[PDB]
């Protein structure tokens, strides 16, 4: 028993970390078969950055420009492409410790892995989601662009996201591994909206599953509701509304757990019109949205 | 910017991780050199675990009952021996993928990352703290048992903990790497005593000097307080009394903020005795004491 913020193991991802120069410019690499993925602002100086013309300054490089490492040996870059907001740097070298792979565009609400990288070395590891706004809540540093994140199952690595910039607000938006930003932003130092975001409702339920079968019970009422009438009370707190896909989605832990997902709903409603009253829920003060319904199957079965 | 609870890159870790099985229960093992260590409870049957003769049980076996899989080729065991609560099963070949390593025995208050496991298999990793009561809040179901707890410098993994049970309470015990338990705690499945827990309150002060580098600074206040003032608060609150000591590693995140520790001190004092008012810091709703001072400067300055 017990419930963490857990992360994918990050063994697969860490062997295809590199380091990428350009000019004065040093982020990180994704080397899979005989391409290196990062963030096109890699040939940006800062200055560049407040208004770049990517196809122009990617004019100015050859192959020769970007230096690409793997711990301490050198590729060589024998070709070069943009695509949407992200280099692809040809090398004459597959990654002998390529994993098993697939390039997928998550959804908003869904969770990731972060493996945080400096200089093409990993620092460490997070779990995290994919805000409603397309932004997600890290850590990162200057240099931690080309940092990505990921699912695995079984030996699969689906690649979801790779970190691009750190809005003024201090949240972080990057690209899919096609280099198609998540969201409205684009990879420019300048003031960009993010959207207002919302509580991922489906997952706190999760989340209040995951704490009925690891014991936390005392949020249990003696109440039910309806779609409707939890939906107000989710658009009057800022929650996602909830659909018939994501209660479809909460049977398994309905199943297990015996609690109806419509009284689970009306457990919700009380926490978000009385609040916590000074309890905690699974070590935790707030409802927790970073926990997808499949995370809790996973995290409650232990899926290897 | 932005502040995650971050677990170290695994992948050093997973490399060690293989599968004991002796009769009908399987276990994690670590495999480093030609060692295989694992809790010497594998060797029980779920009957024998409610109060053990582990060397009468050890006697009855021999190398050929410890069957050891790393991934889905088979060790020959060469040797087995018992130290304290930890079997090592000398196997006829050294790991490929020893990292450099070291056996630690940390202090309560310290953190670490784990790599829950089964059947030999990473599930997934997340940091945590060594309570002061010795006992971790894990995420651990049946047949996790062997997984390990660690740290990491720069190429050096240091393995700090090994997880063997889980108590009635809910919360988990284990061993360093020589078998020693941390805490009062015996392998058996009995009723067992986790002691008072107090909150790690240097950890408190770390976090919220990470908050501040951060943004997060609606906390701080025009008040000053003394070690002496400070403890009787932290007593009432069940938090560690803090020493000279505790102050002087704060003294690197203390000149970074220009915020003395004792200015720091009495923001939280006033936040433990007038509680958050519905506000969060770092994106918790409580005060987490899960990052030690060193944390905070690692994940603030991106070491690799
Ligand atoms: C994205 C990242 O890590 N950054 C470091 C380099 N900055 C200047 C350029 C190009 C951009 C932010
Ligand atoms: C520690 C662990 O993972 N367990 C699974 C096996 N149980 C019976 C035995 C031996 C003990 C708990």
């Avoid at 004459?92 to 990731?112: C, E, H, L």
């Avoid at 910039?165 to 972080?172: A, I």
């Amino acid at each position: 028993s017990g419930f963490r913020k857990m992360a994918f193991p990050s063994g697969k991802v860490e062997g295809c970390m590199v380091q990428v120069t350009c000019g004065t410019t040093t982020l990180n690499g994704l080397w899979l078969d005989d391409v290196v993925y990062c963030p096109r602002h890699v040939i940006c100086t800062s200055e560049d950055m407040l208004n770049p013309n990517y196809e122009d300054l990617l004019i100015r490089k050859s192959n020769h420009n970007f230096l690409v490492q793997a711990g301490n040996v050198q590729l060589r870059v024998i070709g070069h492409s943009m695509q949407n907001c992200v280099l692809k740097l040809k090398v004459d070298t597959a990654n002998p410790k390529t994993p098993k792979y697939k390039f997928v565009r998550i959804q908003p609400g869904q969770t990731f892995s972060v493996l945080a990288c400096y200089n093409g070395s990993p620092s460490g590891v997070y779990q995290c989601a994919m805000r409603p706004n397309f932004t997600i809540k890290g850590s990162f540093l200057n240099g931690s662009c080309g940092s990505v994140g990921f699912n695995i199952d079984y030996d699969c690595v689906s690649f979801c996201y790779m970190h691009h910039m750190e809005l003024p607000t201090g949240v972080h938006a990057g690209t899919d591994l096609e280099g198609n930003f998540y969201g409205p932003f684009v990879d420019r130092q300048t003031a960009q909206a993010a959207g207002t975001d919302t509580t991922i409702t489906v997952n706190v339920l999760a989340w209040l599953y995951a704490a009925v079968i690891n014991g936390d019970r005392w949020f249990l009422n003696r109440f039910t509701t309806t779609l409707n009438d939890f939906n107000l009370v989710a658009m009057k707190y800022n929650y996602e509304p909830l659909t018939q896909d994501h209660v479809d989605i909460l049977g398994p832990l309905s199943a297990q757990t015996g609690i109806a997902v419509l009284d689970m709903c009306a457990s919700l409603k009380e926490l978000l019109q009385n609040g916590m009253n000074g309890r905690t829920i699974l070590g935790s003060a707030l409802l927790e949205d970073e926990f997808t319904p499949f995370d809790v199957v996973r995290q409650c079965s232990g899926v290897t």
